[PDB]
Amino acid sequence: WALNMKELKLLQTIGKGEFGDVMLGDYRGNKVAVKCIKNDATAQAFLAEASVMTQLRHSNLVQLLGVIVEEKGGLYIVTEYMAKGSLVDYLRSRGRSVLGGDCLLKFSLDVCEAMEYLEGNNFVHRDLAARNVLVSEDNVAKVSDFGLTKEASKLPVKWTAPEALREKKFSTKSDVWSFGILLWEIYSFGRVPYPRIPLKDVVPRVEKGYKMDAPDGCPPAVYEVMKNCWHLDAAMRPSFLQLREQLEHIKTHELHL
Amino acid sequence: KDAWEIPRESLRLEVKLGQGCFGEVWMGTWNGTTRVAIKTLKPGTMSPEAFLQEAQVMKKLRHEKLVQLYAVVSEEPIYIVTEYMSKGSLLDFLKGEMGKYLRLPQLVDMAAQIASGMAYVERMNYVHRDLRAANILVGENLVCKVADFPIKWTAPEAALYGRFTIKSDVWSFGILLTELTTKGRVPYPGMVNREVLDQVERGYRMPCPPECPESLHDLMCQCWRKDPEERPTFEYLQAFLEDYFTSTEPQYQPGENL
């Protein structure tokens, strides 16, 4: 998994985030994505992310190409390039007038399969959201950003399940909750969760049973999947395999068109 | 003609709002009551078919934030009668006495309305082609309705290659965000057009105006993306501006000006 810095030319910065930076690059002639992790003095966040990535192999998970370690201290994670950017942007840019129901459901299934794979390998993503899902040149959505990925045990409040923010342990059921939130993002075309509520009301409102409204023009069946992800009693939430089956049941009867 | 068609004695041209090259515009009365704007064509400038295109469209398009056509008079002299907007252009209003009292909550709200209209425009596969504050109208309760050579407000691809699209409209929206946020000012201050074309081409972009929260500027830069397929939709724009003070800046305190 070791790469050579001399063969990597950092072209431009694709995004400067709070926990890391991502840059478009050229490695041995091919476009590639290069990530560095912030606030990681001992480099253990870097190690943890790289390691887990060497263990993931699914067609809907952004693929690790290798690692670059300069003795000076520059630590990078080289990843396959995803030409279409985050799913959030892709949705916002092209929007309702371009993305049909099939496209939206197809994205949901893509993410869902990635998640079923993670659950099947005993991993919890803890950071599933439309922003952390990228789209390739030929429209395949793939989950990315595995920084917080660990086996069955800070978290983005608007995407994290109640028990997760409160309990010290995370589980696939919280991931399922996040999937619910993500779907809402998908059928909302990138809109931000809990639109007309203060970030300081979310958890208390949610725990008081609040649930976002089905997006505009959202298929009732799709919304019921979301809702099913939002049950307050985690154990009652569906399995990712059960989510795939139901999204497939929806597709099979065209309940989304 | 249509039963959009009225007798030209029901109209009552009262106060002259303004003028211009393509006829003038008046406040007034239609039938008994009803306030009305009354646009007219000068027999001299453009033909009947020319100044009765913005009725071909203004008939089909009904939306809360597009200024609504009420009724025409087709056989010249021409009179397009529409709804009255009683604080004049966005520019005057903002740029005039009330202008100085507006703060960010108010300007952001106006902008959310404009986008609500440009999102109805959007849905119908229409294209505005000259979206700027001067072409927005204002009314009671700070309401703002869309309706009716500006290189500085126009997207590169349109300014040069003549590709107007709803995404090239989004570009102007972002320029229009500078208008709301500095309360009337021409974009790219102390630049002539050749610099604006020059510099946007080399990648320049209007900075963040005085006291303008940085979440606003980001969304101007989102409107000013080189590649037009990436600029966000009026539907994204609209929602962002609707939720601004809860989701984006819920810890905003009023300053000197915004």
Side-chain angles (χ1 to χ4, degrees), chain A residues 92-93 96 195 197-198 200, chain B residues 122 167 229 236 243 246 251:
Chain A
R92 297 178 190 178
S93 70
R96 75 308 177 65
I197 291 183
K200 307 179 181 178
Chain B
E122 195 167 61
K167 295 316 202 180
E229 87 270 18
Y236 176 104
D243 294 16
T246 290
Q251 304 262 339

Side-chain angles (χ1 to χ4, degrees), chain A residues 20-39:
Chain A
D21 288 327
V22 184
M23 302 158 280
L24 162 69
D26 177 288
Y27 191 78
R28 291 178 181 292
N30 305 115
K31 281 186 170 192
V32 122
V34 184
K35 174 182 179 178
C36 72
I37 301 172
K38 293 171 182 179
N39 194 284

Side-chain angles (χ1 to χ4, degrees), chain A residues 214-226:
Chain A
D216 271 12
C218 181
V222 174
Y223 183 58
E224 293 177 350
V225 172
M226 285 174 212

Side-chain angles (χ1 to χ4, degrees), chain A residues 84 88-97 189-200 216, chain B residues 118-120 122-123 125 167 222 225 229-236 239 242-243 246-247 250-251:
Chain A
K84 304 282 186 68
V88 170
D89 298 327
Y90 184 82
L91 289 175
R92 297 178 190 178
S93 70
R94 296 185 174 52
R96 75 308 177 65
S97 61
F189 292 80
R191 193 184 179 193
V192 177
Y194 309 82
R196 310 182 189 71
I197 291 183
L199 177 62
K200 307 179 181 178
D216 271 12
Chain B
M118 291 308 310
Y120 173 74
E122 195 167 61
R123 287 188 271 291
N125 299 310
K167 295 316 202 180
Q222 248 133 223
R225 293 227 227 259
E229 87 270 18
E230 281 296 309
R231 271 112 69 173
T233 64
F234 288 99
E235 199 191 19
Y236 176 104
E242 250 151 58
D243 294 16
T246 290
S247 308
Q251 304 262 339

Side-chain angles (χ1 to χ4, degrees), chain A residues 142-153:
Chain A
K142 311 191 171 194
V143 180
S144 64
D145 199 321
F146 306 91
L148 307 178
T149 303
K150 303 167 189 177
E151 287 118 76
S153 297

Side-chain angles (χ1 to χ4, degrees), chain A residues 15 21 28 61 73 88 100 106 119 125 137 140 143 152 171 177 180 204 209 214 216 219 229-230 241:
Chain A
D21 288 327
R28 291 178 181 292
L61 287 187
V88 170
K106 182 52 185 173
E119 177 178 11
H125 192 283
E137 185 44 64
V140 180
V143 180
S171 69
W177 178 288
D216 271 12
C229 287
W230 304 331
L241 178 150

Side-chain angles (χ1 to χ4, degrees), chain B residues 10-258:
Chain B
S10 54
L11 302 182
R12 215 219 166 228
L13 286 68
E14 282 179 54
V15 171
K16 196 169 166 182
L17 297 177
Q19 171 52 309
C21 242
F22 317 89
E24 334 187 317
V25 191
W26 289 65
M27 200 229 255
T29 324
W30 167 43
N31 295 134
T33 63
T34 324
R35 214 98 242 145
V36 276
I38 308 163
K39 224 161 136 154
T40 71
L41 165 74
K42 248 262 138 152
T45 159
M46 69 262 260
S47 84
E49 185 106 285
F51 206 58
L52 276 146
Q53 233 196 324
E54 299 296 300
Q56 229 85 30
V57 298
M58 273 261 110
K59 286 170 216 117
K60 237 97 92 203
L61 302 180
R62 182 177 344 276
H63 186 47
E64 246 262 59
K65 308 295 181 175
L66 260 50
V67 180
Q68 189 44 234
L69 171 48
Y70 281 179
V72 315
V73 186
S74 5
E75 232 145 301
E76 8 175 307
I78 306 174
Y79 299 76
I80 303 178
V81 175
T82 82
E83 66 169 287
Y84 191 45
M85 306 296 316
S86 64
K87 306 301 183 229
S89 57
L90 219 182
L91 195 59
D92 292 355
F93 177 59
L94 178 52
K95 205 189 145 202
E97 175 173 19
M98 294 300 293
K100 60 159 181 142
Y101 295 108
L102 313 150
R103 298 287 164 267
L104 205 66
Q106 277 71 35
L107 300 160
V108 176
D109 181 89
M110 324 220 278
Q113 294 171 65
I114 293 152
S116 188
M118 291 308 310
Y120 173 74
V121 178
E122 195 167 61
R123 287 188 271 291
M124 312 290 301
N125 299 310
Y126 281 64
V127 188
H128 203 174
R129 296 157 130 293
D130 192 27
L131 185 73
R132 39 161 178 113
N135 293 339
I136 296 327
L137 276 159
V138 189
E140 218 48 77
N141 221 257
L142 281 206
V143 175
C144 299
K145 306 187 180 222
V146 161
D148 227 272
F149 298 69
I151 262 289
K152 290 183 231 125
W153 289 262
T154 275
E157 67 246 53
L160 287 172
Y161 309 132
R163 341 178 127 155
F164 296 83
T165 48
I166 194 71
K167 295 316 202 180
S168 106
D169 259 347
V170 168
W171 177 285
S172 329
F173 184 76
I175 305 306
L176 178 46
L177 290 178
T178 70
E179 305 196 283
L180 299 164
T181 358
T182 70
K183 304 204 237 184
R185 307 309 307 264
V186 164
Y188 312 105
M191 284 194 212
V192 314
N193 292 341
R194 202 109 248 115
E195 262 140 309
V196 170
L197 277 172
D198 285 5
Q199 285 265 275
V200 169
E201 279 286 286
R202 297 179 205 114
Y204 183 61
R205 287 291 188 281
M206 264 180 288
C208 191
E211 311 202 299
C212 175
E214 36 264 63
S215 50
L216 242 207
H217 195 199
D218 285 338
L219 189 95
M220 306 165 177
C221 287
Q222 248 133 223
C223 299
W224 306 328
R225 293 227 227 259
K226 171 141 219 62
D227 289 345
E229 87 270 18
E230 281 296 309
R231 271 112 69 173
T233 64
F234 288 99
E235 199 191 19
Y236 176 104
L237 281 164
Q238 168 167 1
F240 176 79
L241 293 154
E242 250 151 58
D243 294 16
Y244 190 76
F245 286 102
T246 290
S247 308
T248 309
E249 312 283 332
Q251 304 262 339
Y252 160 96
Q253 291 286 350
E256 220 176 332
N257 271 256
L258 286 166

